[PDB]
Design a protein around this ligand. Structure first.
Ligand SMILES: *[B-](O)(O)[C@@H](C)NC(=O)c1ccccc1Cc1ccccc1
Ligand SMILES: [Co+2]
Ligand SMILES: [Co+2]
Length: 466
């Protein structure tokens, strides 16, 4: 095809959805190196979550595909005869998957290694990273939601998708007139609850709202929920994620016969502790396994944690500023030319980011030529696949088309921003593309993205199913 394929994409790209918008669309054969389509490939645009590609590759570079994260528990000395200690520390070192059950097993160890009592205070130590909890230009009004999760070294991850810094809020109706039962889940007895919610008559106005008023650690429920309606689970953030982890760990300890007589709160392992006793430790799966629930579902926590991890590796500075310089650096070292990159964050959430479709495709190029390449591939959503962990953010797109089970792309979405970028493998060769829609006045031009994606899939020796 080539110029015929060009014509096909030229046709797609006029669509009345893309009215008033800029679009970096770039296609390259991995093998031939040749450029197969270009348009505004050098234009600066916000990537939203496509930023994640840059973060993922950097992290792979700087930490290696087999890097593992640690949590541990420490006291100044071994427990004393009746099984006692003074202060006690739960210490995060950036594990983006540390779970309530992981906490449990660590508690069980503290018991197993002799401790009957924490006769002083328990600290949640998250100082491996700085404590700047949110990016300069993140929007305040987003904060209660999961994707705006606070960023902290010590952070508990909820459910199999390892969403950090949240709690699940359960809202279950009673009967018409009667109020509704609200659970804060993991955050119970950590965050405040202000339940003004009320079950309404069956099949009526659903007007429920689960909020955390800016600057507070209070879950505000308000509005109505119909009696016949199904129970609403809902993911919501909390302030100081390490304090929550502290609280959960108190719960864990007491639940393993370890009494905690003092306060729970934030604290760093003191410098005057030269022979600290590591009573318990946990180790996350290596970075390879972590990239999946990260990239599949586009997890902001993980991204921004890895930036601060890149920060700690290259500079010993668990900080966006260093993490970010260590991102630019990593990439330059990968062959990627970063002239057009503007880094504000690692997830894409920052409006302050900028990219170009060549900078993307460049990166895609350099990535498939890598010791890690394979694990990089394993992270990206694969179109039209039911199983959330295969489909990721593309599970419900390009179904029953050439691209289904073929195209390896990464999504990026925001009020005025869309993006699709990855690999089109197949019989007639591998292929690499970037489509970065920006400023479109309506809904995210997903039809265009998908229509182009299928085009390439056919171009690779695939057929639409029947
Ligand atoms: B990325 O997936 O573009 C990511 C940075 N976007 C968000 O986290 C985001 C921004 C604004 C509103 C909602 C969300 C969540 C989201 C949006 C699309 C796909 C996945 C998650
Ligand atoms: Co509790
Ligand atoms: Co096929």
């Amino acid at each position: 095809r080539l110029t015929e394929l060009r014509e096909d994409i030229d046709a797609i790209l006029e669509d009345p959805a893309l009215e008033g918008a800029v679009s970096g669309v770039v296609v390259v054969d991995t093998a031939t190196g040749e450029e197969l389509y270009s348009r505004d490939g050098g234009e600066q645009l916000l990537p939203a979550s496509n930023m994640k590609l840059f973060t993922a590759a950097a992290a792979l570079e700087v930490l290696g595909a087999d890097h593992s994260f640690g949590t541990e528990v420490a006291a100044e000395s071994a427990p004393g005869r009746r099984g006692e200690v003074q202060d006690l520390y739960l210490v995060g070192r950036g594990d983006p998957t540390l779970s309530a059950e992981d906490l449990d097993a660590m508690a069980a160890e503290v018991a197993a290694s002799g401790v009957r009592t924490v006769r002083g205070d328990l600290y949640a130590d998250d100082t491996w990273f700085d404590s700047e909890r949110l990016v300069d230009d993140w929007w305040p009004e987003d904060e209660p939601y999961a994707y705006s999760a606070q960023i902290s070294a010590l952070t508990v991850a909820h459910g199999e998708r390892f969403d950090t810094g949240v709690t699940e809020v359960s809202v279950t109706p009673a009967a018409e007139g009667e109020p509704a039962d609200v659970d804060l889940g993991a955050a119970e007895g950590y965050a405040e609850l202000d339940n003004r919610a009320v079950t309404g008559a069956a099949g009526s106005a659903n007007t429920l709202v689960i909020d955390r008023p800016v600057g507070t650690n209070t879950i505000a429920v308000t509005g109505s929920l119909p009696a016949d309606a199904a129970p609403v689970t809902a993911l919501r953030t909390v302030d100081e994620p390490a304090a929550l982890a502290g609280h959960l760990f108190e719960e864990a300890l007491e639940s393993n016969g370890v009494t905690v007589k003092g306060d729970v709160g934030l604290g760093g392992v003191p410098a005057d502790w030269q022979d600290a006793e590591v009573l318990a430790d946990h180790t996350s799966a290596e970075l390879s396994e972590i990239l999946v629930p990260f990239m599949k579902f586009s997890n902001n926590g993980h991204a921004e944690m890895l930036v601060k991890s890149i920060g700690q590796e290259t500079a010993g500075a668990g900080t966006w500023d260093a993490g970010l310089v260590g991102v630019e650096e990593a990439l330059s070292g990968l062959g990627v030319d970063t002239a057009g990159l503007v880094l504000n964050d690692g997830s894409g959430l920052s409006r302050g980011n900028l990219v170009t479709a060549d900078t993307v495709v460049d990166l895609l190029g350099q990535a498939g030529s890598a010791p890690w390449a394979q694990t990089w591939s394993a992270s990206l959503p694969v179109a039209g696949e039911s199983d959330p962990f295969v489909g990721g953010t593309l599970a419900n797109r390009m179904r029953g088309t050439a691209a289904e089970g073929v195209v390896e792309a990464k999504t990026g979405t925001m009020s005025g921003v869309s993006a699709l970028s990855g690999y089109v493998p197949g019989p007639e060769g591998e292929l690499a593309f970037s489509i970065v829609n920006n400023g479109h006045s309506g809904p995210a031009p997903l039809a265009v993205q998908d229509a182009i994606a299928v085009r390439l899939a056919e171009y690779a020796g695939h057929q639409a199913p029947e």
